[PDB]
């Protein structure tokens, strides 16, 4: 395709850059965008033909549903019903890290973006870039994480160009995304609210605003987020020693607060600041994977606060848990 990458100011965007992404999903075109959690590769989510190219190019599954990103309140009406008992909660999370399912009301929005199901995915990001993009486009935009189907969300530019370069026809970057982790889905469709991935909202904030928040199993157990190199996730710290020595050559990914006792190792971050360890944990994965070794070694971490969706993609990502 010949790909274009054009660098903007994330609080204020350069308009003629928006403008020139707006022309090509106007076209049909999928193009590779910021948001405050990872970088998405989008089209118009009225355009069944655009989406489908999202799915050809990430070689996606038809049956993973597309999230459908919105700029206002407005656009909601247009797509969801059923969602006026929850503006209130809304209102206090968006823009924001959120993806909200409802049932859908839109014809607009074709089949191939909900993958035939009755609910569609919402969010409003919280990332300027995003939102002056899909305002001054004038529809919907849907996009997955930018990332080939099962390797770790991108981040930032570098590794959307790893997975993209020469397949998309413009990237915009606006530098390493805040979060470096996918929105939190919670589910009002039911009775009880469902989260379906955790993520920068935390549980225990939603746990607070919703008591009855269910959390399926699938959420605290275990394609996504993995590594080119095997990968060995050790939420049982004192087994460390058996494990590097039954693997004996590695990398590990750890914490700063125990850098110095692994010889190979990449630091993630700080237990300090957690929120360290969120942002990068993708990266390191993807560094993991070059350093030339035959396995990627991961620390555990707490279940709880940003931690618990880190671990939740650990888990998806490893070829061996260590319990
Ligand atoms: N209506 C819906 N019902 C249930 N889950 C939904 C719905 N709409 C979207 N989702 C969820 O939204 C998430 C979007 O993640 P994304 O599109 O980046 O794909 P992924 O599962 O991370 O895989 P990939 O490796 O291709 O990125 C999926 O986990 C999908 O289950
Ligand atoms: C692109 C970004 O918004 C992302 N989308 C996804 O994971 O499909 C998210 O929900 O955080
Ligand atoms: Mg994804």
């Given at each position: 395709?010949?790909?274009?990458?054009?660098?903007?100011?994330?609080?204020?965007?350069?308009?003629?850059?928006?403008?020139?992404?707006?022309?090509?999903?106007?076209?049909?075109?999928?193009?590779?965008?910021?948001?405050?959690?990872?970088?998405?590769?989008?089209?118009?989510?009225?355009?069944?033909?655009?989406?489908?190219?999202?799915?050809?190019?990430?070689?996606?599954?038809?049956?993973?549903?597309?999230?459908?990103?919105?700029?206002?309140?407005?656009?909601?009406?247009?797509?969801?019903?059923?969602?006026?008992?929850?503006?209130?909660?809304?209102?206090?999370?968006?823009?924001?890290?959120?993806?909200?399912?409802?049932?859908?009301?839109?014809?607009?929005?074709?089949?191939?973006?909900?993958?035939?199901?009755?609910?569609?995915?919402?969010?409003?990001?919280?990332?300027?870039?995003?939102?002056?993009?899909?305002?001054?486009?004038?529809?919907?935009?849907?996009?997955?994480?930018?990332?080939?189907?099962?390797?770790?969300?991108?981040?930032?530019?570098?590794?959307?160009?790893?997975?993209?370069?020469?397949?998309?026809?413009?990237?915009?970057?606006?530098?390493?995304?805040?979060?470096?982790?996918?929105?939190?889905?919670?589910?009002?469709?039911?009775?009880?609210?469902?989260?379906?991935?955790?993520?920068?909202?935390?549980?225990?904030?939603?746990?607070?605003?919703?008591?009855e928040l269910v959390v399926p199993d699938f959420v605290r157990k275990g394609r996504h987020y993995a590594p080119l190199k095997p990968l060995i996730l050790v939420e049982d710290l004192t087994k460390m020693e058996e494990v590097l020595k039954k693997y004996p050559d590695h990398v590990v990914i750890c914490v700063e607060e125990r850098k110095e006792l692994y010889d190979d190792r990449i630091v993630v971050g700080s237990?300090?600041?957690?929120?360290?360890?969120?942002?990068?944990?993708?990266?390191?994965?993807?560094?993991?994977?070059?350093?030339?070794?035959?396995?990627?070694?991961?620390?555990?971490?707490?279940?709880?606060?940003?931690?618990?969706?880190?671990?939740?993609?650990?888990?998806?990502?490893?070829?061996?848990?260590?319990?």
């Open positions: 395709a010949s790909t274009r990458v054009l660098k903007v100011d994330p609080l204020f965007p350069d308009e003629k850059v928006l403008k020139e992404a707006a022309e090509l999903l106007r076209n049909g075109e999928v193009i590779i965008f910021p948001t405050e959690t990872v970088y998405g590769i989008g089209a118009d989510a009225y355009n069944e033909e655009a989406c489908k190219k999202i799915f050809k190019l990430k070689e996606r599954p038809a049956d993973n549903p597309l999230i459908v990103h919105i700029h206002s309140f407005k656009q909601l009406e247009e797509i969801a019903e059923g969602y006026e008992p929850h503006l209130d909660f809304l209102k206090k999370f968006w823009p924001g890290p959120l993806t909200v399912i409802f049932r859908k009301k839109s014809e607009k929005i074709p089949p191939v973006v909900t993958a035939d199901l009755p609910t569609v995915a919402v969010r409003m990001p919280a990332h300027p870039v995003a939102l002056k993009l899909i305002e001054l486009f004038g529809h919907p935009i849907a996009a997955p994480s930018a990332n080939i189907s099962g390797r770790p969300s991108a981040t930032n530019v570098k590794h959307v160009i790893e997975d993209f370069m020469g397949k998309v026809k413009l990237i915009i970057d606006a530098g390493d995304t805040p979060f470096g982790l996918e929105s939190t889905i919670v589910d009002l469709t039911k009775e009880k609210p469902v989260l379906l991935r955790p993520g920068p909202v935390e549980v225990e904030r939603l746990k607070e605003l919703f008591p237990l300090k600041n957690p929120y360290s360890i969120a942002q990068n944990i993708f990266s390191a994965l993807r560094e993991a994977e070059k350093m030339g070794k035959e396995y990627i070694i991961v620390e555990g971490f707490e279940e709880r606060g940003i931690l618990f969706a880190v671990m939740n993609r650990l888990r998806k990502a490893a070829t061996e848990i260590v319990r």
